[PDB]
Design a protein around this ligand. Structure first.
Ligand SMILES: Cc1nn(CC(F)(F)CO)c(-c2ccc(F)cc2)c1-c1ccc2c(c1)NC(=O)CO2
Length: 249
């Protein structure tokens, strides 16, 4: 019988291409539209992953949908950091095999400072020597990191799943012989890193919401997957119905 961690490895989405077109100039509009398509492709993968994620099907369907919509940018950003760490040792932002950002591309995107904040997370992966198992568990914790302020359908089911994944991370870190003598300190660094995702993700979402609302005027394209997510989520955000959960705040 596979452990949850073994299942997480099996269900982890494969890396996809962005469809970067070298025949078009690296204008901000072209780069952002490409990123938005890549995010749409990856969000379809996230939905398929969530279907087979241990424990998730035990939450009401409406809560599963809510949680994906409340965490999508965090999930995608955390995966971006992992790819950047694994494939470039965090020298570059590895969006896809056909879309790798250096500083020039960060400027060309019109999102330099946001990209720099993402790069800082990937540098923390190097500092920590984050493992794949830590990454997969942490990604589930990000799915469970932001909730409506006016309630999920099942508080009980959500708390059970979140508690279970916190315990998975704690057990993995504190039982690993590589961490002996320092494992609780490592656990707290990992949970502080999770908390820091809220800061970055809020900033990413604010800019994405801006270009979404001004999409036609700015000539920034969005795929239907993102139109669905953002059209559902933005009224909830504007209403104030968002509670980021922190380990240390
Ligand atoms: C939609 C989206 N997804 N990801 C993650 C991804 F890996 F690139 C694709 O799945 C990002 C992203 C980009 C750069 C980062 F450093 C970190 C995260 C964005 C993103 C953030 C802000 C945006 C826009 C996109 N689009 C816009 O039009 C203006 O605002």
């Amino acid at each position: 019988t596979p452990s949850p961690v073994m299942v997480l490895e099996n269900i982890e989405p494969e890396i996809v291409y962005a469809g970067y077109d070298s025949s078009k100039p690296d204008t901000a509009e072209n780069l952002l539209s490409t990123l938005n398509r890549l995010a749409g492709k990856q969000m379809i993968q996230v939905v398929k992953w969530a279907k087979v994620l241990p424990g998730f099907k035990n939450l009401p369907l409406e809560d599963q949908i809510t949680l994906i919509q409340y965490s999508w940018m965090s999930l995608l950003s955390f995966a971006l950091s992992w790819r950047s760490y694994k494939h470039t040792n965090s020298q570059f932002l590895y969006f896809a095999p056909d879309l790798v950002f250096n500083e020039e591309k960060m400027h060309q995107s019109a999102m330099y400072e946001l990209c720099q904040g993402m790069h800082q997370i990937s540098l923390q992966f190097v500092r920590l020597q984050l493992t794949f198992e830590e990454y997969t568990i942490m990604k589930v914790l990000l799915l469970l990191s932001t909730i409506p302020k006016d309630g999920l359908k099942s508080q009980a089911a959500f708390e059970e799943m979140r508690t279970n994944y916190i315990k998975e991370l704690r057990k993995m870190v504190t039982k690993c012989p590589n961490n002996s003598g320092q494992s609780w300190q490592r656990f707290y660094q990992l949970t502080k890193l999770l908390d820091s995702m809220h800061d970055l993700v809020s900033d990413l979402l604010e800019f994405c919401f801006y270009t979404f609302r001004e999409s036609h005027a700015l000539k920034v394209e969005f795929p239907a997957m993102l139109v669905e997510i953002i059209s559902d989520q933005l009224p909830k955000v504007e209403s104030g119905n968002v509670k980021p959960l922190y380990f240390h705040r």
